[PDB]
Structures are given as C-alpha cells and as structure tokens.
Amino acid sequence: LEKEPATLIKAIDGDTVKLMYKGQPMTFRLLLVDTPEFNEKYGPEASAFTKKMVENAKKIEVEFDKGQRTDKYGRGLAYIYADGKMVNEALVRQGLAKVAYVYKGNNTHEQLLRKAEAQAKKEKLNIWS
Ligand SMILES: Cc1cn([C@H]2C[C@H](OP(=O)(O)O)[C@@H](COP(=O)(O)O)O2)c(=O)[nH]c1=O
Ligand SMILES: [Ca+2]
C-alpha cells in the first residue's frame, strides 16, 4: 500500500472526514472501524478526537487498500494518516472505535487494528469501560 497526499477540507465525525484528494473534494470513511454516531455515547468524544488529529496535522495522507476505493454512498475508503500517525488505529487504541466492516480484500491493516482494540479493551478505555 502507498500513502498519497490530501488536504483537510473539514472534520465531520469520528470516522468520516472531508478531504481534497487529487484536487477534488471527497468524503472519506475510515476503513476497518466504527465510531459511535454523534448522538450516541462516546460519539462526541470520537468526533473530537478525529477533529483534533486531522486539524492539528501538518500533513494528511490517504492510503487505499487493495479493493474497493469508494463505497455505495460515494465515500472514499481509506486509511488516513496525520503526520504519519494512522487515525483509524489511534481511534481503536483509545477505545473510541470498534474494529468493524472487515471485508475481504480491503483488510490489510486488520491485525494491527485488532491488536490496538485488544489493548484498549484490556485498559477498559471509553467504549470498553
Ligand atoms: C467502512 C465501510 C462502510 N461501508 C458501508 C456499509 C454500511 O452500509 P449501510 O449504510 O447499508 O449500513 C455503511 C456503514 O457506514 P457508517 O458506519 O458510516 O454508517 O457503510 C462499506 O460498504 N464499506 C466499508 O468499508
Ligand atoms: Ca459510524
């Protein structure tokens, strides 16, 4: 997998963000995770967490996996990095997202994220508390 440049347009919620990618505005849905909706327990904290990570970054990158790059709603499906740190993994490590939506051929970082989830759960962080 390869990291590509993007720039932040706007934070949206815990697991979606609007980025400019190859010059075009696109909503990105983070692969392999599920954050609570804003209206649910931990939803504001997830949204806040992702917002801070992407707004504070000097460099945002997008990494597509091997499979589908857009979902049925036209959202980009990617791993998102903020100054070299993966947002997807960070949310899971903090107990602000569950590993989820693991579909064959877009699951390169699955074991990495499951390892983060285990550690979040062992710590009883946030959704695991
Ligand atoms: C993460 C992800 C979501 N989706 C679709 C499946 C779910 O469809 P349904 O909307 O039909 O439930 C939805 C969940 O996204 P949200 O968690 O953003 O709601 O997005 C994918 O098709 N591939 C993916 O990799
Ligand atoms: Ca969600």
For residues 23 and 14, what is the distance between their CA atoms, to the nearest angstrom? 24
Query: What residues does 70 pair with on adjacent strands?
Result: 76
Burial of 116 (0-12, 13-18, 19+ CB in 10 A): buried
Ligand 1 centroid, distance to 52 Cα (angstroms): 23
Cβ < 6 Å from ligand 1: which residues? 29, 31, 34, 71-72, 77, 101, 103
Q: Look up tokens 């390892």; give the residue.
A: 115
CA of residue 61 relative to chain centroid, distance: 12
Assess contact for 79 and 66: CB atoms under 8 A: no
Residue 123 CB neighbour total at 10 angstroms:
13
Q: Which atom of ligand 1 is nearest to the CA of 35?
A: 17
The conformation of residue 4, written as its DSSP 8-state character, comes to E
Query: What residues does 85 pair with on adjacent strands?
Result: 82
The domain 1-129 is classified under which CATH number: 3.30.70.270, 2.40.50.100, 2.40.50.90, 3.40.1410.10?
2.40.50.90
Domain boundaries, the chain: 1-129
Q: Which resolution in angstroms does this entry have?
A: 1.7
Ligand 1 centroid, distance to 29 Cα (angstroms): 8
Q: How was this structure determined?
A: X-ray
Please work out, in degrees rounded to the nearest 5, the angle formed at the alpha carbon of residue 44 by the alpha carbons of 41 and 45: 90
Q: Which atom of ligand 1 is nearest to the CA of 71?
A: 22
